[model samples]
Target chain A: QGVNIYNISAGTSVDLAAPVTTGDIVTFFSSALNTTLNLFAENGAYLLHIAFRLQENVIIFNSRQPDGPWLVEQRVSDVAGAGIDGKAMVTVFDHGDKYQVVINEKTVIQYTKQISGLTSSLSYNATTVVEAVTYTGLALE
Target chain B: MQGVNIYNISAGTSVDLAAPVTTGDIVTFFSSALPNNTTLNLFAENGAYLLHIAFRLQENVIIFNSRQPDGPWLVEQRVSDGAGIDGKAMVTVFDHGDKYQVVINEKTVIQYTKQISGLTSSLSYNATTVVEAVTYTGLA
Candidate 1:
């Protein structure tokens, strides 16, 4: 007889638009990069393998295919106060390497490489915007 | 830019419960048997193997479980309309083996049964009152 529920609506889709360059990652296909990659591959053997879920949690990255246009080198947000619960995980590393990120268990970000993508490709954005989403892994790698 | 929008809330709680018997397919934990101080977890997956749950309520017919609804408990079925007391309840099950047709927020009170399993569980709720979840349909 007393239900005062509040809010929690950001299931998936965070309105990204910053520097997602490389010609928007080659017109982004394969179902829009499997909606946000749970794992992608543009040319195998560690040539662009990806893993994504953006709004319900899950990430993985790799690159090597001809190498060159691998932007998004870092962009982590919140991650559920280190409790590492779902719907809050953003990781984009490629600039140099050597990295670590943890949430809930707290370890927000750990670095190693100094940041230098030959030309440039590591911007950030998305303060809020996500809700109900699904994304599988592996496709082009 | 201070930023903090995961769906702003001031106060929270929600409810919905129903399960009149049949209890057998496996996976049940009705917030410790209903009515208040709720803590819930319901997971029964079959892409591999998963059956988790947490409950702590006591009324009469809210004895649901699978790891702590009581203990080595494993009964599945008998969950009806389970109305709303606080706000969120989106449980939807229709696995017809012995009998299971629970649907909370969308209505469909209960069909009840047990001993017939398939795999479709993952409804987590926590509350001083109520809160439901189960709409994760992703596989394409």
Candidate 2:
């Protein structure tokens, strides 16, 4: 099998169980109190970090250099909102060079950056009820 | 009805075959970057550790050990012939009833002795290096 979907709740975090590379997408049903996703390098180095603030309709993207302080890289706005079921269905597309985030199937932010490896993990700290989270392994017909 | 479970992955992942163990079950996984620490932990249904093999990249050798159910953590370190743990390394842990046979690339590395007992529930990667795919041949 190439993909796995998990049903998760608030305040829970788990391993990705596999490394995520280009074309891999992560889709989750959540509301957000800072649900976060992170990617790491082969040497256990921190690569990219992202946090979602659903209530504010914004995605806080952050990154830092090996010798620099951690700071807010960008704040992507107008990309998040609850769907008909009162929960946000967020999906992210990884292109290795950047990321594309879609809220409820609507394209929002197409941010660019260069990341080495796509090994990933997740942390959910939201209060809203979360459904299942799906990860692909992405790319469609 | 029984065969192999394959997980096509890349650096930083894990796989569990979730099958009853006999004596010849095979586990294959790879790491492009070692020192990430590849660990194969087989746990009994009661949560007791059945098997544990650990190898550190920082060291010039491979260490095989286990956490016994009653208590102590048993360990043994063996030096590599010359492989020295560099580049993408594909490793295998083959169950041999009472021991585990380890193989890297083409050479048979270490045939590790067992310190405990149980079915395998998980293969954990510490997420330090590039782990490509994790596969396990189911019960025979």
Candidate 3:
């Protein structure tokens, strides 16, 4: 397992390069409000974009093809604020043929594309703290 | 690493389950429109019918299982007005385990203990509707 932690400032983004393969689980934990978290695959493609607008109390999940228009967008109630530290943990895993996004240990969204053979990375903007953990050969429970 | 199997079913079409099943496996079905009638069949590896989940036209969800393929179908759980419109439904089977759980739109609607084992499952629907997708997430 590989872990990276950082503190982010408003209007700034932190980028971490992490090589990811199929069946690898990448999890991000943050304690920031009004933040936008982005996960990218190979060739700088956007795999997932999670926007947490705490002020509005709404969370949005977006996914698209490599360099393509956003195809799937889901708006769900933001439950991250319920955390004691106003933080949330988001876990992303490859389910053989698709990607599953689990928020706070709850499976929320599934994308129909396998993210294997891609150079994965994470970027955080307008957040206070971000911690990412990458696990190989382990499934998300 | 274990594999995940997914299926895209069209309205009025049937698709066979290809994922290998054991105890504690979770299978999920999603549809853009929850039509009146949809059936999920659980079959043993020897091509025997073990159980089924039926979604009736009047918005009733029923579960039936049998020891033999042609045997009487035993009613398990029947819930009225428990179906979802343009939403998702999930069924979790437990072999040698506790209870079977049913979820609609991520909400638990029913859970019971009637043990049955099957190697695969199938899905079929009626009416011209939209079937979103299906997934088999194996237990860790």
Q: A-chain TM-score per prediction? A: 0.24, 0.67, 0.68
Interface RMSD of each: 14.0, 16.9, 14.9
For model 2 the local lDDT of residue A74 reads: 71
Between candidates 1 and 3, the TM-score winner: 3
lDDT of 1 by residue, B1-140 (tens): 00111111111322221211112222212121233444433334422112222223343233233443334545643222143322234333433444554443334455545432444443445543323232211111
Segments in model 1 whose C-alpha atoms lie over 4 Å from true places: A1-67, A70-141, B1-37, B41-52, B57-116, B119-135, B138-140
What's the C-alpha lDDT at position B127 in model 2? 45
> What is the TM-score of candidate 2?
0.41
Q: Model 2 residue A47 lDDT?
A: 55
Worst 10 residues of 2 chain A by lDDT: A132-141
B118, model 1: CA deviation in Å?
3.9
Query: How well does candidate 1 score on lDDT at residue A129?
Result: 26
Docking class of 1: incorrect
| DockQ for candidate 3, C-alpha atoms | 0.02
TM-score of each: 0.22, 0.41, 0.44
Per-residue alpha-carbon lDDT of candidate 3 for residues B2-86, written as tens digits (9 for 90 to 100):
3344455666676676655555454455554545666655556555655566677675555444445656556556776444322
lDDT of 1 by residue, A28-83 (tens): 11111112321122222122333444674544343433445554444444233311
Query: lDDT by residue for model 2 over B20-136, one digit each (tens)?
Result: 554646555545554435565555555556665566667655666677567777666465642322234546666677877666654567767777766666555554443533333
